[PDB]
From a paper:
The Type IV REase SauUSI cleaves DNA only in the presence of the target sequence 5′-S5mCNGS-3′, where S = G or C and 5mC can be 5-methylcytosine or 5-hydroxymethylcytosine. We show that target recognition activates ATP hydrolysis by the helicase-like ATPase domain, which powers active directional movement (translocation) of SauUSI along the DNA.
The structure revealed that the single polypeptide protein SauUSI is a dimer and is made of four domains—the N-terminal nuclease domain, followed by a Superfamily 2 (SF2) helicase-like ATPase domain, and an α-helical coupler domain that connects the ATPase to the target recognition domain (TRD). The structure also revealed that the interaction of the nuclease domains of the respective monomers stabilized the dimeric assembly. In the dimeric assembly of SauUSI, the nuclease catalytic site appeared pre-formed by the ‘HxK’ motifs from the two protomers. The structure of the TRD revealed that it has the fold of an SRA (SET and RING associated) domain, a fold that specializes in recognition of 5-methylcytosine in DNA. Hence, the apo-structure of SauUSI may be that of an inactive state.
Author numbering:
A (entry chain B): 2 to 192, 219 to 347, 352 to 373, 380 to 412, 429 to 668, 680 to 707, 731 to 743, 774 to 799, ...
B (entry chain A): 2 to 192, 221 to 297, 301 to 334, 337 to 345, 353 to 371, 380 to 415, 427 to 511, 514 to 669, ...
The structure:
Amino acid sequence: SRLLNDFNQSLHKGFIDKHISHKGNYTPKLLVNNKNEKVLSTIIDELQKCETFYFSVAFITESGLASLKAQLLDLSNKGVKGKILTSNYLGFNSPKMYGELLKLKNVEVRLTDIAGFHAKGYIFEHKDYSSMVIGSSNLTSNALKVNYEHNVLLSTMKNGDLVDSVKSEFDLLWQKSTPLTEQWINSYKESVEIVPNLMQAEALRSLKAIRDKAKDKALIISATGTGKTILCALDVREVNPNKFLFIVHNEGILNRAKEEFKKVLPIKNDSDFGLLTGKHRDVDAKYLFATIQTLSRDDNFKQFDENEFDYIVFDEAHRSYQRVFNYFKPKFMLGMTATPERFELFDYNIAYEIRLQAALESDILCPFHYFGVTDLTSDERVNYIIQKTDYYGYSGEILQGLIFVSSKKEAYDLADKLSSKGIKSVALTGDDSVNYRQIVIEKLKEGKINYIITVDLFNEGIDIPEVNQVVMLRPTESSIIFIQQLGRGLRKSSNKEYVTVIDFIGNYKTNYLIPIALSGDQSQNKDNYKKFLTNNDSINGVSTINFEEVAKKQIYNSLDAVSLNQNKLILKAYEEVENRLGHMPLLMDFIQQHSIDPSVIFSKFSNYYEFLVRYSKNLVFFSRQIAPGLKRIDSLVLEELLKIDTSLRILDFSFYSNQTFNMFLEDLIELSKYNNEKYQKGLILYNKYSREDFIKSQEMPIFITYDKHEDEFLSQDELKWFTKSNRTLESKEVQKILSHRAKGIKMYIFVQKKDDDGIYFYYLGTAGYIEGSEKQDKMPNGSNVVTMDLALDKAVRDDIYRYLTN
Amino acid sequence: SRLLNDFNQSLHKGFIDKHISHKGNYTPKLLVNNKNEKVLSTIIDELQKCETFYFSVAFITESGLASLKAQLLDLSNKGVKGKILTSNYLGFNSPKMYGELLKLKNVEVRLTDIAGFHAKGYIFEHKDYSSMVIGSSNLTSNALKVNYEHNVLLSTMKNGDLVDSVKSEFDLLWQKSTPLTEQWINSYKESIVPNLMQAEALRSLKAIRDKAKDKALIISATGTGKTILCALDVREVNPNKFLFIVHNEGILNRAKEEFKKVLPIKNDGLLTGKHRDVDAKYLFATIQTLSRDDNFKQFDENDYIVFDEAHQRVFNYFKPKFMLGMTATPFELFDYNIAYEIRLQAALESDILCPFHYFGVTDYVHRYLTSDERVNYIIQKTDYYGYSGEILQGLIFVSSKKEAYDLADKLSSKGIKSVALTGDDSVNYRQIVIEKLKEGKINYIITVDLFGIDIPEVNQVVMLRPTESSIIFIQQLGRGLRKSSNKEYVTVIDFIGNYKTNYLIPIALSGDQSQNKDNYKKFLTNNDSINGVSTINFEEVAKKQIYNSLDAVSLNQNKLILKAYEEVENRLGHMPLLMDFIQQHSIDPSVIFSKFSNYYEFLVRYKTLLTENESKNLVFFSRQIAPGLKRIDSLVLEELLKNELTYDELKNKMLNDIDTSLRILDFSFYDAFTNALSNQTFNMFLEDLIELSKYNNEKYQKGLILYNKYSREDFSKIFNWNKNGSSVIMGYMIKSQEMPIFITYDKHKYEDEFLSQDELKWFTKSNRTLESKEVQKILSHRAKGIKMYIFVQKKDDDGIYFYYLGTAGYIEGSEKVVTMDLALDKAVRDDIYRYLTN
């Protein structure tokens, strides 16, 4: 039985001999640690491919159950049921948490009362074998994603002594635990200096450069629209101005920004911090915080001495509000805005750009759990939406959410429809008055209503920190749009630990765009976005991105049937980049401003110039030759030429208007060097190379396009290798190969996925041969092929393995 | 080679097939805190036999480190060094606990501040292989003995891949972590309900209350937990004329607060001396304030009096409804009616005591015994197993009055403020010195006599005297067992010297009165069933001293049997039958049966009826009834006495296993008895042995029980043999579908040897060879006949009573003196395993 032969090998690698290259995914007995192979990754996998599961976890947090929440639903639609066992030891679990458990209709939950229940055991029963994860990780996003937790993944066959001891232990306290219902829930409810981090200090240095270069009008854009006020205060603290004025368009944000400034700064509360709202006129204060409405009305700005504040901060929705109130002549003018769909006002100087991915690493954003779901007709949609929003739930104690719809007629209708049977449901639109917008905003903030429904008022407006839930009921028009509406929920608040965004996916042509926004991947490779899309969650902090199975296919279909090289998309990207700088930009400005990777420009046009021409050989070669770095032998030696074998190889490769041309060479070579460092440092593992970028003398390069549905992986250490058809199984075709992997030459294995293209071939490392009975022949019909099982020297990573093996 | 074949069988059994047997001890284990198995056992176990350890454990507490402390000290003297990795993830990891980590001489403690350090990784590498314990247990006493935890013990080779990951991960952040030095430590700157035992007690008082007796006493060996038991009985019936009498003054206020907690009504008395409450019908006076100048004439002679051991006597004269008392004494008064006896084991189960960590250490080698060398050794030892709180508030019991004062002077000259306090001290100097410790003005009070002292706050109990008795030991252990705010537990340090009286230490702690030296030695090796947070530890050189004291002394002499009889007779007031020994927790009646033929020959020997015929009847009656093996035999005797029914019509009636009825009858069988019944002494002694049959059986046997000491004769009797043979069975003997095997295990040439927890080597008698007359029978019988029953004794144990460990059978290929490897059907328990394999 191969099942036993596979287990023996794997059991032999995990406990006896690590150098032996096994042929079994069962029980290599791996140690799960949160070092870019997060504990959440393998527990999702074991959940996906299991018939049943029973957990014996002592501590469940709601944010952690959210990470498993979409995987358990897809399991319920598959017919997979499970059990969970917990306790009320130390009063740690909350009723709201216990309520989310009851929503798992396919998960059976009982509550034990053994003293000091601290067990943390997850057990997955497969069809043939079983897997157990035992260790220190609770069911909480800290233990699951970001922590230093020790657990061990043990796979095993159904007759193991360890399994029996565990199952018989579970069934013991399961037989004497009490089940979970709402009736049980009712009984339970009755009974210092802030220092800049990596992103800010990086942002701070850019502002300093603008200051130290003698200018006075800068700008800061935040895609989400958040994370700015604290950045400003850090920057104000360095300059230490005599007087400082902080302009804002929204009054609620104003006071919050003031309190936020107080934290960064040690000065007296009364002396320096003054509000200048409708009801406050602290004009004598050293740090003044004012709405434009009050500064503009009745020339209130006129009573202030011009150029008396050394530092000003507007947020650039307040321009052209009061255009006339730009008259101050301060030492430094700084504006901050949510990124523009379309600054000219601030003399084309961008201090720093806040991107979603960067801000998540910096822990300046509220964590979020994105959830993509299936299926503007009110009746059917409303009831489906209610039951889907109910399942995934909200992060706080009460529901405070903004719903984004496709059109205004839908927004108002949906609100009244939702209003039936308890949903609060009030709609705002571009049509509605300022007073009405403010009133209903206060209503949501005051928890008077749960849902505010809009379509357009997401830009520098309705910025509310308290929102638990962001619902998307519209085709994602743009990445920027998609982010800004995510950004509406990303402000940290007391009521919410995280923010759940529930994204309904329908037959929209633009679903490729929604995985595009979530990653900072301007380079349009459909493989990069499919790889990030599927089980590549080891990058984030505590936030998770989950897709239901059917929704995942919907995005896949949309990304496949849509061209990303469209001439309309590249034209719009050029115009965006032009606005960023007010110039005809070089390819750099597509990088520094994160718009379009120049490798995407070349896929449609052989030159940037030719694209300019719609609205040669030197350009196409010089980019292509240098656009990737490739060890920098060319980068440094051709730099010397501009003004040991690998060196030689670089010379042979280069051999084998005009002033405008020199300038244009500069952008391409500069991109070359930047591209080099960011992607190739100074032959890098788990990277992508193309045959050109790469059996010879001391070279045996294998390039596979994995198509198992043929070469197939047997474990993380072995795969089956086919030669060409009609290969001799003897003499030159095989005896050269059977010698190479045996002795002398080393193999270089490259694996593509069948959807991918030429410039993209993963590199997995080196290999050899099993040397034992890796012989074969062909089918009766065809031309003699040879199959051999090779032994990888470096085992393949989890996330790489899971994406290649579907 | 041999290692791998053993290993693969263990991998196979753990991970592939639970039903095969295996050689070696490498099967993965599920560590849970069971009331039969605990994680600490296995952690200690892996510690003892390893070369080097390194723990990657997030949370460590003082109370857990004390358990590893004694073991880690032994490891230190063997040249074994370890590593410990810890982090202050949740911010508290108390600074003192970090001082205790510094004490660990053979442990490199490092400190990482990586985010959320939550791992619990215990790795033990022996020279041949490695062990890994991974799960949810922290280095805390609750994670290692109480809480329901989940750990997996994994044995592995040095080249296993799983250990590569764990070792390489540990090395990564060991280099990134900062070493635990004292400078860094100092640098740190940051900012009503009745127990289940009660039910037993107030049941006894209620039973006494049903009768006309108005006097009863409860015995507390430690002398604690007395307050909340009385007040619970005072609440049952409220005499509304209540008066509380004690000899200690600091206890008066404590006892008054406790009684005020159980009773909910208002406050409105105590007259501690120049005090003036004297009313409200709730008194809390002392004997001295009453005894001085006759102050009992203030109230009528005529309802809930309760006293003390040392509590003038003319003030005991006046009559009330329900007088009582509470003592810790080795009463004669109170109509000789003892209500309940609080013993150590029971009292620790109801959590009325305080947790304790005993530490048996070796006294210094080479005043008479208060030199510079013995002083500096006691210092470096009490420092090691340090105190459980934050300030040291301990007691020290030495052996002579002269030692107490001289040691106090020498101890205090080293910076450890100590004061002696012997019986020839004044009463006011005691109260000045006692309240000097309660206020933390000093750290120690050395004594010989006063075990006066009644301070709850005591951290340490140091013992520098031979254990005089079993009673004295527990009493001066009870000076810490009271609960207090300053302390989490009581560390107790007993200095084991050359004294011959060390054998009493396991006798006092276990509570096992059946003085069998195997039962005690078992309590030395592994007490994995001692529920609660508390632990008992012996240094290796100290544990052998207790073993020597057990071997070198006998527990049988006729003077001790007589002493116990006089002790029971003084607790009873009458002459004790055999049920009075057990009911008072005196020596098990088997201890009387070992030297004297029966209880009648004992009573006459130390000051009869139908002597010769009655004596033989009593000796057999002991055999049949006293062990309590096989209830039906005892019940059949009762039916014959009363039912007197018609042959096997009665015998059948019993069924509402008939072979078992028949051998009960055989045992009794194989006219004069009515004449023996006509005697009143014989009928009286019968009514005692029969009840002794019932009690022994019900408990020990009615609850062939596994992992029990069983006798050749006892097995033959249990299994309805005609023979009831004892001499007939040897190492191997086989009946019809039986073949029990009895082995005296003593590994250290070719002998019976345990190969794993389910597979040993059997050896036949006297080089009988090959496929002989009996071997082939044994092989065919295992294959097609007897279920092989097996019993294991230790080399030291003498009784024919061997531990039963299930059934076994000849492994097929094992047939290679006849030597064969057999497979047990139930793997032998860990405590039994450790004790049987020494």
